[PDB]
């Protein structure tokens with residue numbers, strides 16, 4: 001299911017036996033309780049532009 | 056960068072500038088506080104490995120504003136499959152002697168997982184390429200970091216859409232084309248090692264490395280980039296290894 005639309009994951013997706021999918025996040029992020037969204041756990045997470053984020 | 060625009064200061068925070076004896080060599084991409092991804096062919100002619108410097112937070116080459124951070128390159132790792140003088144497997148992983156300090160102007164680009172990059176990122180049409188390389192084919196380099204948005208093509212569609220020349224390097228699975236064939240926009244000499252960054256749901260990822268092309272923005276041709284997804288595992292494995300004596304290190308690939 002990861003193959004189809006990133007399995008709904010905001011970042012990384014891992015397939016499991018059956019219709020079980022697990023979303024994961026890059027270092028410096030935590031997976032939200034919705035199981036798909038990633039939120040920064042540090043001041044400067046990768047791939048984010050500060051001057052724009054703060055705007 | 057040809058036919059692009061100035062990257063507003065701070066909007067290309069992962070962009071790296073590589074210097075050799077103080078002179079402009081190439082660009083690179085920061086992926087964490089001590090690792091930089093660049094292009095292997097940037098080191099073909101280097102003889103004095105101790106004079107290789109990496110500059111983060113750089114924007115305007117004519118002025119020091121305090122956001123710049125310089126680090127000596129402690130190690131340059133290149134895949135064993137890379138052959139000097141050619142363009143296949145054009146990637147290099149660099150270890151800084153000391154970590155850079157993340158700030159508003161110094162931020163790493165996310166190195167994506169292979170699966171994510173192949174079945175998701177690879178399909179995002181447009182991506183940003185940047186550098187202080189030549190503004191024109193056989194032209195002068197830029198004083199301010201330039202950025203350009205370019206569309207990615209299927210190698211197949213790249214092949215039968217480009218003016219077939221001769222002895223022109225083959226487009227392999229370790230590459231991909233991006234840009235325009237109307238001779239208006241493209242990356243250029245000096246931009247090599249620079250990032251081809253792709254956006255996906257609010258975050259940017261490294262999908263390419265400025266690698267090569269026939270001239271710059273040559274009508275009927277596209278810029279060619281190193282397909283990073285093919286090196287994710289190779290990179291992750293090296294970042295987990297202890298440093299070794301000697302700057303240049305050829306590592307087995309796969």
Ligand SMILES: *C[C@@](*)(O)[C@H](CCCNC(=N)N)NC(=O)CNC(=O)[C@H](CCC(=O)O)NS(=O)(=O)c1cccc2c(N(C)C)cccc12
Pocket residue numbers: 081094096097142221222223224241242243244245246247248265266267268269270271272277278279
């Ligand atoms: C490391 C870099 O800075 C640089 C980036 C160039 C990106 N170009 C574009 N986005 N269009 N990489 C290189 O310099 C790698 N080599 C080339 O791009 C090379 C140009 C040589 C030069 O003029 O200095 N082109 S190529 O690899 O397509 C190439 C290779 C071999 C022969 C070529 C010929 N021969 C037949 C004269 C013609 C055209 C290109 C050739």
Ligand SMILES: [Ca+2]
Pocket residue numbers: 113114115116117118119120123
């Ligand atoms: Ca400066």
